[PDB]
């Protein structure tokens, strides 16, 4: 009965509170304490995952309390296979991002000496609020945390960043908050509809009850209202997890923010968009999702190819990785909205693999960018000679983001592509071209940077490119280790994800299409 889920999200926020409250002189102690809180949250995640039985009921570790009955929302947490997977992703990443951004806040001034403490506390608050969103089984609670986590990252981008930090932070927050406010419109519409229907005792936000009612058919509502509410949810989840048209904010912010914070935005937080698409959009609005399924599928595939192309066209390392993440988000959304067990399971595993892979690749690029203070690709050359280990890890990460079977991401992309073929073969081929496009923007980048004659000031002067330090080794090794393990033996993660995907597909009245042959 222990509040495992509640503690899981509480610990990061309380840790941020303690950290920001430390004396400025305890900066080193602040770093260590933040790392310790992250590790404690990861241990909580470990116990939650171990106790979770994917063969058991859909929702586990369910904690329920009354929070705001006037709004029909209660503090209800419960972790399913998909939420468990993303929770494990967030937990494993956050300590690594902390030890990745160890010195990121050193060169800041002001904040009464709390710049390091502010950085770490903001990171912890983001981690905890993302966790709260993931394990929240209350629509309004989830929206609360989903929208609010924009603010800690808005600060984390604006402070602790490059020259365009102000502009990129504003664009990020405004895009995402406009989406969130559209989802607030949709949330209030959903509350009104539930209040207008006899299926519920009163206007309700309990996700489980609403899902059960819509599945049981009792909660019968006009398809027009459902379409509009679905669109409201979709706009916010699309701007959050960048669906092609709305991606525009992510490139700048990822470029401007410090690499650890940018990875925290992309690998962890942006996932919450697709997560919502998987949990709410499909399981609240099955008929609307089906009706809009072709258009969203088209948008996701176009996003895949479009992000791949733009990454190809990027002169900037960080912008290239951001567009690569956009294309991978296109993959995730495509796999989620194809409503195929292969598709949804592959897209969940793809959220995991893309989180880890982008984290590794982007952090390696961030170290390289730190060594020489230029983000321009042409500013480098022959780095493979000076920093062999940096180049090796960068190549491994690229291979991961390249969807090579020897690494994790392939297992997912494949699964998604397979899923897309059973319902939209043209779209499946259109996305499969991204296998080629990924090779392009990955290997061309590595060629321009690591190979060729060593560029000026690369191995000499005041800005040489020194190899990876031990701390960067600690950051990098676990990520590549997970990539290898999940590529070789995804069986545990897939076994966790599949029951949740099957539950979802049963919920929305969809099934994997039968093979052509009888």
């Amino acid at each position: 009965t222990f509040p495992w889920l509640t503690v899981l999200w509480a610990v990061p926020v309380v840790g941020a509170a303690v950290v920001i409250l430390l004396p400025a002189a305890q900066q080193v102690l602040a770093k260590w304490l933040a790392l310790a809180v992250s590790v404690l949250t990861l241990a909580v995640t470990a116990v939650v995952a171990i106790g979770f039985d994917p063969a058991a009921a859909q929702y586990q570790f369910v904690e329920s309390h009354r929070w705001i009955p006037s709004f029909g929302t209660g503090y209800i947490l419960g972790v399913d296979g998909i939420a468990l997977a993303l929770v494990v992703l967030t937990a494993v990443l956050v300590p690594l991002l902390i030890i990745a951004g160890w010195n990121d806040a050193s060169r800041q001034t002001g904040l009464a000496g709390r710049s390091v403490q502010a950085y770490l506390a903001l990171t912890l608050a983001v981690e905890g609020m993302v966790l709260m969103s993931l394990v929240a089984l209350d629509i309004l609670l989830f929206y609360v945390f989903f929208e609010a986590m924009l603010i800690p990252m808005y600060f984390l981008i604006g402070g602790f960043g490059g020259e365009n930090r102000s502009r990129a932070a504003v664009k990020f927050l405004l895009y995402n908050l406009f989406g969130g406010l559209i989802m607030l419109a949709a949330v209030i519409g959903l509350y009104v509809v539930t209040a207008g229907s006899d299926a519920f005792a009163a206007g309700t936000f309990d996700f489980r009850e609403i899902v059960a009612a819509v599945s049981s058919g009792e909660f019968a509502v006009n398809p027009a209202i459902m379409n509009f509410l679905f669109l409201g949810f979709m706009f916010a989840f699309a701007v959050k997890a960048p669906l092609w048209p709305f991606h525009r904010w992510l490139p700048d912010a990822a470029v401007e923010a410090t690499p650890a914070s940018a990875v925290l935005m992309m690998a962890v937080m942006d996932k919450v968009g697709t997560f919502g698409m998987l949990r709410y959009c499909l399981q609240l609005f099955p008929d609307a999702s089906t009706y809009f399924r072709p258009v969203v599928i088209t948008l996701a595939a176009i996003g895949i190819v479009y992000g791949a192309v733009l990454a190809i066209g990027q002169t900037d390392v960080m912008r290239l990785i951001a567009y690569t993440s956009i294309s991978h988000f296109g993959f995730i959304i495509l796999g989620i909205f194809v409503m195929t067990s292969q598709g949804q399971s592959g897209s969940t595993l793809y959220m995991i693999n893309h989180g880890i892979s982008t984290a590794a690749l982007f952090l390696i690029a961030g170290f390289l960018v730190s060594r020489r203070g230029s983000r321009l690709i042409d500013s480098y050359g022959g780095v493979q000679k000076v920093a062999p280990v940096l180049a090796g890890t960068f190549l491994v990460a690229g291979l991961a983001t390249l969807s090579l079977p020897g690494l994790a991401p392939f297992i997912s992309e494949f699964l998604v592509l397979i899923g897309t073929f059973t319902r939209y073969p043209v779209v499946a081929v259109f996305a499969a071209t991204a296998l080629v496009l990924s090779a392009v923007y990955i290997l061309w980048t590595y060629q321009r940077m690591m190979t060729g004659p060593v560029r000026d000031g690369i191995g000499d002067g005041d800005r040489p490119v020194r190899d990876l330090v031990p701390r960067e080794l600690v950051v990098v090794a676990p990520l590549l280790a997970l990539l290898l393990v999940l590529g070789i033996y995804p069986k545990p993660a897939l076994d966790v994800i599949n029951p949740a995907v099957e539950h979802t597909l049963t919920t929305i009245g969809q099934t994997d299409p039968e093979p052509t042959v009888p």
Partner: protein, 621 residues
Amino acid sequence: PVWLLIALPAAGATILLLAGRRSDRWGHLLGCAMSLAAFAVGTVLFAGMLGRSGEERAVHEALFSWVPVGGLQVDFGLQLDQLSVCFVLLITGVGSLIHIYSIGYMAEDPDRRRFFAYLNLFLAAMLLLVLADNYLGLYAGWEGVGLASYLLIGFWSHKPSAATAAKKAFVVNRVGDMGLAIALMIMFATIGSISFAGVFAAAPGLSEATLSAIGLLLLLGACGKSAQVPLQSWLGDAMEGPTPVSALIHAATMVTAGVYLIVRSGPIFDLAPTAQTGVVIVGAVTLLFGAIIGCAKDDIKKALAASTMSQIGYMVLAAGLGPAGYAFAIMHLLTHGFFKAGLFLGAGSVMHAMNDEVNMRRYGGLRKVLPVTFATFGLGYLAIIGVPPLAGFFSKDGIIEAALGAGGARGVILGGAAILGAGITAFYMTRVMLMTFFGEKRWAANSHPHEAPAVMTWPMILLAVGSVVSGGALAIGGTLSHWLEPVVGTHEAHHAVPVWVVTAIVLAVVAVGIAVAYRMYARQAVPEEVPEGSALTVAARRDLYGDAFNEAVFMRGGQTLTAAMVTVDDKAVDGTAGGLAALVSRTSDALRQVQTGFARSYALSMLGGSALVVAAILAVQ
């Protein structure tokens, strides 16, 4: 267990990568040892299968469930069948010989440990390719071989040519990978199984269109790997890498991957006459185009690449022959893994003696200066030419016999193209062999040679022997066919025309090409400057302009699309949001002008608030 064959080299490579520079002194030993262990394990398993005669000769492990998602249930199984064992033995033996040779070849180069790491990873990848009993593990090995080829080709990163060649090779292989991925998607969506067993059991119910699509996409994948048109352009440029990399890629594992894919999917192709037609067309086109390219290649590496392309085209044609040519195709593939590997080792010895000289027209008379290397190269040369004692002669005769038995105008055209390929191959192989071993010394600077150390000698001698041995050892009595018969279909011996006349024609064309080459260089000389043959020769030095075809249609068009999409992003997607922002800002300024600061203007707005009065009064109507 069979999986050890995969486990051994990969683990080796893993250590060779995980140990770092601390293993630079002894790593090569571990890499060669692990390759030799893989060869020993494969031989032991082959002996075991020989003991289990008849049926039950094939190994089948089915280790564990790999991706049990929905109806996929792909298990990480392995099948070392009568076909798979042949490739296992070839890959292991040739790779071990190449590792042993590379010991000396890469002795003077730092990261020799890293180079052997990459080679062992390559061997692991190729073994996984041939050992997977489902298409998912086959794709895993496919992409692994692609990555290993990239890494090894890119060895010597300081050379921009090496990096560019690696990138181009991997990207073309990735086009092939996309083709194979579409093939797998079709297989799953139509059958719901990805195993060889399930796919080949459900194949008979498949329509001609589905089978044609699957076979065509698999043939595209092979074109990617085996460097058939239109993806044949990457073969030439890869030679910027070390000679052993080219040897391993072209002779045994990388190049033969496409032929293996065709052979294993043989059940699909035989059930897809359109797919077989495509495979045959691709084989003929690749054979002719590669032979024409080799007709002009002056760099020993480039000429060897053209020769490999032509041989792979011949293998593709034979395999597209269906059950008729599967056996001959595989036999020639093995004989090639022998003689072409020996040719690459000899070429590497020549280059190491020539101070890394690449141009064949920059040296000669080496037969009087590199006797053992000259002899190994000559043995592989007699093999690739197709002398009756030569291994390649028997395999090529079998392929051409199947082509002739193909009948009709199609079979005649295929046979004629194969004969012309034999002739052109003889012509340019003769040009190369005369240019290096025969001819004037044509040395440059010091050019003081010496027979490569024993470590290099022994692998080269063994490859030459396997060129003289084998072919006959696999064609005499049809033992290779009787071995492949249980798992590789055998339709019948057409016997359209006597094998004797076909063999005589082959010998005649080989001799005619040899004589043409002699008159070109034996009576004439090897000019230092460009021979300037003009017309095709010019087009032949540019790889038949094939690279330009990529650089023009794709690279230029790809850059066009990239710039267009960048403009779209910066101007349409970003521009719409910026226009909305500008609208908001302009409207804010216009509204803010309404606060003129005159209290009487505010009062005027309030009195116009009689808008409220009129609206409430009109609310009745």
